[PDB]
């Protein structure tokens, strides 16, 4: 589990969105595994605006933050899970790192701020849904 709290937005994995998220919906995209809802309180996270390929992510199944090198956001075929059939996921970045299904929502960050959240994984890989292109998260 986990979310990004920037401005009056909450960014979560679409597959982990709650009824309150759907009832306060700002934007969602199944191909990216992302959903954004509105919040009453202002958040403290800031979004990175860059093309870094090194950063650190939080792994709840180890209670640890790990440094990683990761690929650029791309269209990748992801195997089936209980939340989606096997399909192409867009804006996804891969790295070598430990992960388990409940690690989704952990933040990946670089020197500039938050880069994205854990979305996919297995066999020593972890995949992150990028948010750096969502410029509107910084205003309104
Ligand atoms: C919960 C789904 C969401 C999903 C996105 O694309 C399709 N399904 N993801 C997973 O199944 C999953 N995520 N991580 C971090 C893993 C690590 C090891 C094994 C499985 C996974
Ligand atoms: Zn950066």
- H helices within the chain, ranges in order? 19-23
* 59 and 109 share one domain: yes
**Annotated resolution, angstroms:** 1.2
For tokens 């992302």, what's the residue? 34
Q: Which residues line ligand 1 (CB under 6 A)?
A: 15, 33, 78, 81, 83-84, 89, 99-101, 103-104, 118-122, 126
Say how far apart CA 23 and CA 38 lie, in whole Å. 9
Whether the Cβ atoms of residue 121 and residue 92 lie closer than 8 Å to each other: no
For tokens 């090194």, what's the residue? 54
For residue 26, give every residue at least 6 positions away whose Cβ sits within 8 Å of its Cβ, in sequence order, or none: 9, 36, 37, 38
Which class for 5: exposed (0-12), middle (13-18), buried (19 or more C-beta within 10 A)?
middle
* 61 and 27 share one domain: no
Ligand 1 pocket test, pick from 121, 125, 126, 130 with the greatest ligand atom count within 8 Å of Cβ, gives 121
No. of helices (H) and no. of strands (E), the chain: 1, 10
Span from the CA of 81 to the centroid of ligand 2 (angstroms)? 30
**CA 85 to the chain's CA centroid:** 19
* 35 and 100 share one domain: no
* 105 and 89 share one domain: yes
**Method used to determine the 3D structure:** X-ray
Q: Domain range holding 122?
A: 45-140
Say how far apart CA 118 and CA 77 lie, in whole Å. 16
The kind and range of the H/E element at 7 are: strand 4-13
């Amino acid at each position: 589990s986990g979310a990004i709290y920037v401005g009056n937005y909450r960014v979560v994995n679409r597959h982990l969105a709650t009824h309150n998220d759907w009832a306060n919906l700002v934007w969602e995209d199944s191909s990216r595994d992302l959903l954004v809802s509105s919040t009453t309180a202002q958040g403290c996270d800031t979004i990175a605006r860059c093309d870094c390929q090194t950063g650190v992510y939080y792994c709840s199944s180890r209670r640890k933050h790990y440094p990683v090198s990761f690929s650029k956001p791309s269209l990748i075929f992801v195997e089936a899970s209980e939340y989606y059939p096997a399909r192409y996921q867009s804006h996804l970045m891969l790295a070598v790192g430990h992960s388990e299904p409940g690690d989704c929502g952990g933040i990946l960050r670089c020197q500039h701020g938050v880069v994205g959240i854990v979305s996919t994984g297995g066999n020593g890989l972890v995949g992150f849904a990028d948010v750096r292109d969502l410029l509107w998260l910084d205003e309104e």
